[PDB]
Amino acid sequence: MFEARLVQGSILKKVLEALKDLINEACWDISSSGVNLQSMDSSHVSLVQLTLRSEGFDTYRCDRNLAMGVNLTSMSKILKCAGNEDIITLRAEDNADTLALVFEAPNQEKVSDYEMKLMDLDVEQLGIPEQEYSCVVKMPSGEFARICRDLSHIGDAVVISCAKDGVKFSASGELGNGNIKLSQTSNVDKEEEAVTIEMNEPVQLTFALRYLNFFTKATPLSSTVTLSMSADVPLVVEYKIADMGHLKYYLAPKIEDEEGS
């Protein structure tokens, strides 16, 4: 018997509006550590890794480990009928197939029990490497979301660079060239508006713009986002939820072969 009590529906709402245009079907692993979502997209390029800890929920109870799989657009439309100040009760049992979302409304008088039908897809678990990378940059999430929306217009795929100085965004689009470079943003009053460089080895890699745009729809979950780049292991975009868990997006590069000349 799996029962999770989300304290606020806003974080679930932002998680689902982040994952709405990326994943065909979402798989949840349920254990005493909490809930896990390690999955691929509809095109087998990106990876989603959502971890929700046990202490973040109001009441979290689980007897046996559960591997459920649900349609995602159906769950987006189910969660669309919900407020932002209501506790959310995810219910499932041992030997059935219905996922129940029970929450309050903004009237705070009426219960709302939305049933859903799961899927029977057996998905091989891909092992996350959990290795070190070549560059780690801490940056506020609104900056990354607005620069993804700003950089989607110039081109179709973008090359990003990180070095000892700071982070760099480049786009060789049909309109022309778009190049930004930001470093040493820590000299403000706010603690969110800060860019921190951790590692040494500079990296330049190109990625599709649409996957970055679908990654940046987790904007108000975390005030600060973490970007990890490496030459071999994929690009990591990590949103740290404050008292619930974390959410990582992994993005594979694209081919940019040099000219023969």
């Binding site: 087998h44 990876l47 092992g127 599709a208 071999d232 590069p253 072969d257």
Partner: protein
Amino acid sequence: WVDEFAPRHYTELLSDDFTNRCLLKWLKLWDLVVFGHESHEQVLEEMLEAGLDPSQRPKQKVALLCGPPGLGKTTLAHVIARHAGYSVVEMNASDDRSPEVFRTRIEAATQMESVLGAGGKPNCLVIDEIDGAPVAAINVLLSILNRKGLLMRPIIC
């Protein structure tokens, strides 16, 4: 209904060894660009050895496995792509009617630098039922073939 008797290695294929040998030769010909490693039968062996692209590519980049709809050509391509060091990412041209979602399933799904979590397991594209596809989709695939970014992953139609 092919539950445990499915082929998985190169020793379980049910085709003639010349066709499988030349198919494996064409699949391993891409190791110069993908991995970076350095009668009609004689015509095929001449065109598979003599002359290449300047970017270490073969002259042809798409294989047309024409034949009757049965006879297990898809399973053959699957086990050969498993044997050659790639992973099979299959796709279907019959459920894909709109050209926009076709380019999503082709130009936004594979044949880029799809460095996944398994770094030792690259991917190859297998397409079935290319005859029933609309002419816009095959014109799009022709434009992808004639793109000079460069196409590096093999296509097994």
